[PDB]
GROMACS .gro file of C-alpha atoms in nm:
model
   42
    1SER     CA    1   0.000   0.000   0.000
    2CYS     CA    2   0.214   0.272  -0.159
    3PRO     CA    3   0.152   0.409  -0.513
    4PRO     CA    4  -0.022   0.139  -0.727
    5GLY     CA    5   0.204  -0.142  -0.849
    6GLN     CA    6   0.442  -0.082  -0.548
    7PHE     CA    7   0.456  -0.289  -0.222
    8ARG     CA    8   0.678  -0.295   0.096
    9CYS     CA    9   0.910  -0.586   0.183
   10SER     CA   10   1.060  -0.642   0.531
   11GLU     CA   11   0.910  -0.357   0.735
   12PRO     CA   12   0.537  -0.375   0.850
   13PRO     CA   13   0.274  -0.093   0.830
   14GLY     CA   14   0.271   0.190   1.088
   15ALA     CA   15   0.637   0.232   0.969
   16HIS     CA   16   0.556   0.337   0.608
   17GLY     CA   17   0.918   0.316   0.479
   18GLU     CA   18   1.023   0.282   0.111
   19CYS     CA   19   0.849   0.033  -0.114
   20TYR     CA   20   0.956  -0.153  -0.435
   21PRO     CA   21   0.771  -0.237  -0.765
   22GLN     CA   22   0.540  -0.544  -0.778
   23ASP     CA   23   0.747  -0.620  -1.089
   24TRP     CA   24   0.986  -0.710  -0.804
   25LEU     CA   25   0.725  -0.952  -0.668
   26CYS     CA   26   0.820  -1.291  -0.823
   27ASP     CA   27   1.077  -1.149  -1.067
   28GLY     CA   28   1.267  -1.484  -1.055
   29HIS     CA   29   1.530  -1.287  -0.855
   30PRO     CA   30   1.498  -1.189  -0.482
   31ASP     CA   31   1.534  -0.827  -0.369
   32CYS     CA   32   1.334  -0.809  -0.041
   33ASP     CA   33   1.648  -0.781   0.174
   34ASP     CA   34   1.516  -1.129   0.273
   35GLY     CA   35   1.413  -1.231  -0.081
   36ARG     CA   36   1.051  -1.250   0.048
   37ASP     CA   37   0.943  -1.087  -0.277
   38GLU     CA   38   1.006  -1.423  -0.442
   39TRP     CA   39   0.846  -1.632  -0.168
   40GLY     CA   40   0.541  -1.818  -0.290
   41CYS     CA   41   0.508  -1.580  -0.595
   42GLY     CA   42   0.162  -1.466  -0.459
   0.00000   0.00000   0.00000
């Protein structure tokens, strides 16, 4: 919950932080600083 097509990785809400594209949600390459963008691909 950022702009559309952008999600947040390894920091929960109430600490809004800096998101990444949902292109970088199952890219075939991790980036989540845990790679939890890859995890389960949905």
